[PDB]
């Protein structure tokens, strides 16, 4: 599997984020994060570099080449969906970065390095950066960098933007509300979508969860993991025991068999913002964020940089867009209680997006 490091990192990141946010809706693009952090890693040296390699799961020496190849695959023209990943480097106009870093970053990340005036016009630069991301995401991520995130000490902002719009291979019927069980003391009504279709469905006994694949048109699918636990979300077991080995066997090998499935899932939309320094530090990436210990001499031979924060913003809008059967003997997948979901690029086996839906 040519995306294994990114998937290992995605699951560990999810777990660490789940300590910060144990029960509420969560949604992120681990692909986006990995690509941003690979650009930052290119610039790192010494212990900073060593820690980043461990954390990003590169140790589990042609890392940048892999990113370019994965990125080409994800960006490959299809008529089946819109899917775009783009990297961008914004640099202080008066700073002098290593020519080899600027060259190699463009070569492997296509980040089109661009000068901006953090030193004297940090707020305008913040705005320019946000506006760039806004465009790349078709308006969906309008203000990536919050107020106060960039200042006269900022020297570089490394950015990835990812955009996906697809239709289901088979449309859902909008049921024209069902109680969604939020926790043992709360049910909330949600708009359900229904589909009866030939679909891959299985059960992961180690995680006590059903798994369902809902394909988009083209080689992207959403996988849903639905526990069948606790008095809270019902996800504790799944979230703590999920691993690469456990998941990959079911998403990417052929443990799932096709059957006629009656599927009920909510129509939902999430928008989540994270600041990942604390999470990343907790994962083992300490020196990068340590103003006195960081080594980014790959980016500048003056060795006068550190990573102050990693801002992530992600959103998803899930809806219906894509006779005479009355038996109900076979499989049901009724997502009326919390579940994990991920959007998988099937060719690369990369996880593009990963989330927990728990609260309508």
């Amino acid at each position: 599997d040519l995306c294994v490091a990114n998937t290992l990192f995605a699951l560990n990141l999810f777990k660490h984020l789940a300590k910060a946010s144990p029960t509420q809706n969560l949604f992120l693009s681990p692909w986006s994060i990995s690509s941003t952090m690979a650009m930052v890693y290119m610039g790192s040296r010494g212990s900073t570099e060593d820690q980043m390699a461990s954390v990003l799961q590169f140790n589990e020496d042609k890392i940048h080449s892999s990113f370019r190849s994965l990125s080409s695959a994800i960006n490959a023209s299809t008529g089946n969906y819109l899917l775009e990943s783009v990297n961008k480097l914004f640099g202080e106009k008066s700073a002098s970065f290593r020519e080899e870093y600027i060259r190699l970053c463009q070569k492997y990340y296509s980040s089109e390095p661009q000068a901006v005036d953090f030193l004297e016009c940090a707020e305008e630069a913040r705005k320019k950066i946000n506006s760039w991301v806004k465009t790349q995401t078709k308006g969906k991520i309008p203000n990536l960098l919050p107020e106060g995130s960039v200042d006269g000490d900022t020297r570089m902002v490394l950015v990835n933007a990812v955009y996906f719009k697809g239709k289901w291979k088979t449309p859902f019927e909008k049921k024209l509300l069902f109680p969604f069980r939020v926790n043992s003391a709360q049910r909330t009504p949600v708009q359900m979508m229904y589909l009866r279709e030939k679909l891959n469905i299985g059960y992961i006994e180690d995680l006590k969860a059903q798994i369902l694949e809902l394909p988009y048109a083209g080689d992207v699918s959403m996988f849903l993991l639905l526990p069948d636990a606790d008095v809270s979300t019902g996800l504790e077991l799944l979230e703590s025991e999920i691993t690469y080995d456990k998941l990959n066997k079911w998403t990417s090998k052929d443990k799932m068999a096709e059957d006629e499935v009656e599927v009920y899932i909510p129509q939902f939309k999430l928008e989540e913002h994270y600041e990942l320094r604390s999470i990343l530090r907790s994962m083992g990436m300490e020196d990068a964020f340590n103003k006195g210990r960081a080594n980014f001499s790959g980016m500048s031979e003056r060795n006068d940089l550190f990573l102050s924060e990693v801002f992530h913003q992600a959103m998803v809008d899930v809806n219906e867009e894509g006779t005479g059967r009355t038996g109900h003997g076979g499989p049901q997948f009724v997502a009326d209680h919390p579940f994990l979901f991920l959007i998988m690029h099937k060719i690369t086996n990369c996880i593009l997006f990963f989330g927990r839906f728990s609260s309508p």
């Binding site: 693009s29 986006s32 650009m39 790349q136 960098l145 933007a161 006068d304 801002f311 992600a314």
Partner: peptide, 14 residues
């Protein structure tokens, strides 16, 4: 499904 994300790493001078 429409989905999107931005990620920004901020490098600061010391």
């Amino acid at each position: 499904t429409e989905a999107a994300a931005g990620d920004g790493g901020v490098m600061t001078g010391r």
